[model samples]
Target: LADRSKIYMADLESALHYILRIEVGRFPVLEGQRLVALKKFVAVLAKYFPGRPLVQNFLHSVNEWLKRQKRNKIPYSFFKTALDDRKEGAVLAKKVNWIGCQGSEPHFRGFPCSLWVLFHFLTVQAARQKAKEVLPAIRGYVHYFFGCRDCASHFEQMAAASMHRVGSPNAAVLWLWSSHNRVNARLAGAPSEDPQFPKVQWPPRELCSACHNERLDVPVWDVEATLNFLKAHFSPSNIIL
Candidate 1:
């Protein structure tokens, strides 16, 4: 059974690589870390289930692909190029409109929370007073995308706190979410009627697997809706500049 599972995993890896190249287009240069992390995850799976010939081959193939691909870097120049492209404008506009679609509400219901945390963390870290004035507009835009009164209200509070802090809000928020686990916990279960407590830190992936599972079988339409929201609102142009 263990050997069979390894074979299955290997097949899965091969299928993923094929899909990535043919469907997703050259592994998306912007998502380098994501690709690397995925490869590492597969390696760990192989390590756990040794003695599977197929799994061994899969790992080797994936590692070879990784080595061959040019390392993509994220920088201001990358953002500039994306913004300069005419395709980006239309894509962005479509994404903005898609945020209004009903299907978009599920996966992205918590986005305002994420953005609020990110903005606060960034501003505090940069010690930039400009973010304080920008907070209201940012909150309003976030509300436009999320359309959740509760998330908007929560962002307001977070924005206020971030403005008062002298250090990096970006780091603070990342630490709060990635290191401590705030956002994942909320998504792990169904939306609650009662308000959740303010989590100072974010939880790890393993800790929030329940929420992760909840998203596993989301409908295709819903997935499209979320993608549109991200493309429109969280596009590199919108986020950085």
Candidate 2:
């Protein structure tokens, strides 16, 4: 709909709905580790998600509700009730639709891409005081909720290895960006790689020429340029409503 693809606010809202209702719903019961993971995930979302007021209110309400619950084990239906609440005109997208993250085939680049985009946006929007929580929130969510076991393990190992070194908000964003690029490189030729949407270093030269270094044979990422480009690319000002 626009010249060159851009991030759609609608897609983010849709993905949030999918994550809250579908992704978490996959679990039969929320207890112990699972419940705590969800609590932290929602808390971070409320604190950092750059969303419309309606969605922000919804997240805030859910975060509060989850924190207040004292049960050792809670049924999925109980969480569903809290999620479906709309008393104050707070609402979320009811349909599952992908704009920037859509793939050519049915089983490719949908939920996973949307999720990565969500965390990327969160990390970019996070304030310095609370920025440290963003990556840990993402790690917890992936470890307890993401369906792909191997993907979750890989992310955990990556976080364990160097996530602690992210000393600032900007560094957090770049850390996730670099981590995503590494995953893309690893999966570039795998069976799961989408034929049409082949994984490549994000913000390729075609999208951001300045993000690459002048090279003879191999492509080299210009870190400073890439970080600048990422900040602007994922900035709230660039979101399409």
Candidate 3:
């Protein structure tokens, strides 16, 4: 595995620039205030996941950002160049190579899909480790930096309302699972809907046969089984990309 030195550099740059170009600035995104929690989030990711094959792969994607920092002080500016604000030419390339998030439309699935996957993975990791500050760090990241104002608002509300009661972390995983499905349900068959990736309540019948049960009219989740599925499914080791 160490024969060659391939890492996540290209994909990492693309993702950082992708957000910079698309995240329409309704409100201030990633000001100096959010640094504390943001760095903590990054540290926890590196700490809990260790050097597992898949874990290091994902971390290396952003480790440069981490590496560029002074101790724990990382900034959103790490993603941009000094040329970013030039009046003339475009500093960031417009092309984005979205894999699983590729949608029917150009903008439909790219950044949002990245954000969703990132948070879901972090949340799952946080639950497993019983990490107390992880959710707050996640909230800090999303609230200050997510491109979609509406998405940020809703997610913030969810965190505010009940993320504190993450007493049962497995149940906490279930909470995110169900919450995401609700968002998908809201977008299902709508213009934002990717014709191919129609939000079918996730972890579909195909992935886990026992995850869903009950009437054909409305499916039910087997709590025990669903938690196990999420534990395996969203963990860093199992992530495909």
Candidate 4:
């Protein structure tokens, strides 16, 4: 028989892998209690194995999303000020523990209450949170899942090299941006270059000439930082994270 620690580790890893797979396009059939049970199981595992890196990462990501949701309502001015001083700002990190208790079921059905649910609710939430600092990448991904081809194309053009590489923040942003642009363009009947394109100025530059020239390095960190900066600036107040 396997040792207790090994068993625990295996079970935990399996659960995390299952969640990750479901998060991606691998398994589309999960629904109802099955999904709920999975979340509960993960929570239980988290309780027992508090130090696992996967669990830690998942929890942090969920918490961050919860924070974003909570701040979804306050005026941008107030929220941005608080976020700018996040390191020392008590108001910004006010509700850290609130998201921990919110179960991850409603989000799966599109209710948007818990981080886990929101993580799964929006297709790109996981990618965005995982990338840590890149909002455009995450937005681009959400757009793709929702079928916005033009936005996807724009993101692709803007962050082509990063998109080509795996786990690049640029790649994530490109996916989301392109997908979003595609949908928005369709709605407005505008060309890809239309100035009215929902250009998010948050990622600093839509495209990096230096990165493009090098064709070797990925600007994952820059993309992630840009995203974090935007979330800090735009999120409203009522959110509890």
Which of the numbered candidates is closest to the native, going by highest TM-score?
2
lDDT of each: 0.34, 0.82, 0.59, 0.33
lDDT of 2 by residue, 1-241 (tens): 3323478886788778888888899998999988888888889989888877877888888888988999889899988877767432247656777877777787988778888989998888883235688888898899999977887888988999999999988899899999998899999979988787878888877899998888767558888888788877887788888
Against the true structure, what is every candidate's RMSD? 18.3, 2.5, 7.5, 18.2
TM-score of each: 0.28, 0.90, 0.69, 0.24
lDDT of 3 at 22: 50
lDDT of 4 by residue, 1-241 (tens): 2221111222323323333332323324333443333333334323322234544555444335324543223333442333333331221222222222222332221111122222221223333342333333233333333233533455445445444443554344345444443434444533332232232322324333222222347543344454444333222221221
Instruction: List where candidate 4 sits over 4 angstroms from the true fold.
Output: 1-166, 189-229, 233-241
Deviation (Å) of 59 in candidate 4: 10
- TM-score, ranked from best to worst: 2, 3, 1, 4
lDDT of 3 by residue, 90-198 (tens): 3224576655555677867767775666556666777776366656666777776676778888888777888777765565677777878878787889976777677
> What lDDT tens digits, residue by residue, belong to model 1 across residues 1-241?
1221011222223233332233223223434554444344334323321223543454455445445556564333443343334232332222222121112335542333333333333323222223223333334444333345555565555546553452443433232233223344554554542133223222223333222224456632232332233223322233221
